[PDB]
């Protein structure tokens, strides 16, 4: 065990090196290691095949360092890795799309708040067992199609506080067993109509604090099990386009929130749910 780090065998074999002031990934970490805590240090790169010896790794944290890049095969050798935390890494920005290849038994992956500009094609490819996906507080500017396709068992997906401007048809395709989907606090303008299809089991949907002026007829239906919904402070235009959406909020006997209007100038700050239908102009 290397300079000023805890090392214990029960419950699991463990290297705890929290805020030592480390400039990079340390030599010395036993191959027996079942958990590696390298968080709060000041590491600026994860070299190729850093933790390759530790073929037993199930939890590794590298959050709250000064990450500039992860090398594309950093997590090579880590078949069993279950938890991976890579957050509070402010200035990181991009993760090579092959970085996660073959982390087959991964349960949880954290990229909360990393200033991620893109979401490379097939980055979450082959993450069969991924369950929790934390991608909030970044600078994500689009959502490619199929970006999470291979995410069979993802229940919680976290996307808030980004700069997304739209949701395209096939973005959320494959999230067959999603549960909480948080999409609030974005610059979001248009949802694609057939966009939530593959989300039978969706339960929580937070669309508040966006740029949504209207939600078109076909959208919400496939959420056959939605229990909570949030659509507050959007520049909602309350005329014939909302009738579709209006009809929906009537039938929905779960728990929605206020849908305040803003337009026409005549109909400002008026929860839609308590409007009449003839109230909304034509057409």
């Amino acid at each position: 065990c290397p300079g000023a780090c805890v090392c214990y065998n029960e419950p699991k074999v463990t290297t705890s090196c929290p805020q030592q002031g480390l400039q990079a990934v340390p030599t010395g970490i036993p191959a027996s290691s079942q958990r590696i805590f390298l968080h709060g240090n000041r590491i600026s790169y994860v070299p190729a095949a850093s933790f390759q010896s530790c073929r037993n790794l199930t939890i590794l944290w590298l959050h709250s360092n000064a990450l500039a890049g992860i090398d594309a095969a950093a997590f090579t050798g880590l078949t069993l890795l279950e938890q991976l935390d890579l957050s509070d890494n402010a200035q990181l920005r991009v993760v090579d799309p092959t970085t996660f290849r073959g982390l087959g038994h991964l349960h949880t992956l954290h990229l909360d708040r990393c200033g991620l500009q893109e979401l490379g094609p097939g980055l979450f490819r082959g993450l069969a067992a991924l369950q929790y996906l934390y991608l909030q507080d970044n600078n994500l500017q689009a959502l490619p199609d199929n970006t999470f396709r291979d995410l069979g068992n993802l229940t919680h997906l976290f996307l808030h506080g980004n700069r997304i401007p739209s949701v395209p048809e096939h973005a959320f395709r494959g999230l067959h067993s999603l549960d909480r989907l948080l999409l609030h606090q974005n610059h979001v303008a248009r949802v694609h109509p057939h966009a939530f299809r593959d989300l039978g089991r969706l339960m929580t949907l937070y669309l508040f604090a966006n740029n949504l002026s209207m939600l078109p007829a076909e959208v919400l239906v496939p959420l056959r099990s939605l229990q909570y919904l949030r659509l507050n402070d959007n520049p909602w235009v309350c005329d014939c386009r909302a009738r579709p959406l209006w009809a929906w909020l009537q039938k929905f006997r779960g728990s929605s929130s206020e849908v305040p209007c803003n337009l026409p100038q005549r109909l400002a700050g008026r929860d839609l749910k308590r409007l009449a239908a003839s109230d909304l102009e034509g057409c």
Partner: antibody
Amino acid sequence: VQLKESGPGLVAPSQSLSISCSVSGFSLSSYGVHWVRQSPGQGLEWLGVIWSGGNTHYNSALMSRLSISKENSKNQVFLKMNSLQTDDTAIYYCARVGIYYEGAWFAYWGQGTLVTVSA
Amino acid sequence: DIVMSQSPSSLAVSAGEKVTMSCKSSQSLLNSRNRKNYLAWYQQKPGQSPKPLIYWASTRESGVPDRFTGSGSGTDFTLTISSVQAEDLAVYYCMQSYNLFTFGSGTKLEIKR
């Protein structure tokens, strides 16, 4: 923390070399070992390494020639080298640290065991 | 492939004069982002194994006298002693750590008297 290279010290050409590198100050499961060579009047040259895990990367400049094994409990790294000419007369240092990264880049050495290829 | 080039192989100075080694690499040794440069310097005193003086082009190993400097980026790397001590007689090797491990050919400090 130290490494102390040893073993067969004159080897006849077209035959086998066997070095051992013994250690105090650290375990072979926790850190990985290297092997640097240096002539009796030339620059250093890196031969290979055996990582904290079972894996092993040599320099292939020496084609088949080369094999690094290590015995973990016995705290010994073995450097075996067959089929060597008098090109390979040199001192044979084992050094350490160790890989992935920070910790050391041959920041520890041996004094180095000097091999002569001659008959 | 990857290659390390040291000049001027051997250079004599009195004790107190400044110096510089020159170490050019075959391929650039700078990590795109974070910008640390994977290059070390080593000191081989006579009849004595090498000893780490510097790594990451720039930063000094534990203990190594504050009187050394190493700089340059990408592909040109200085080692500089200001006010050379008598005890600093050695040959000076730079080492690449980007693609495995490739050494220079070394540069010997002579001492004028």
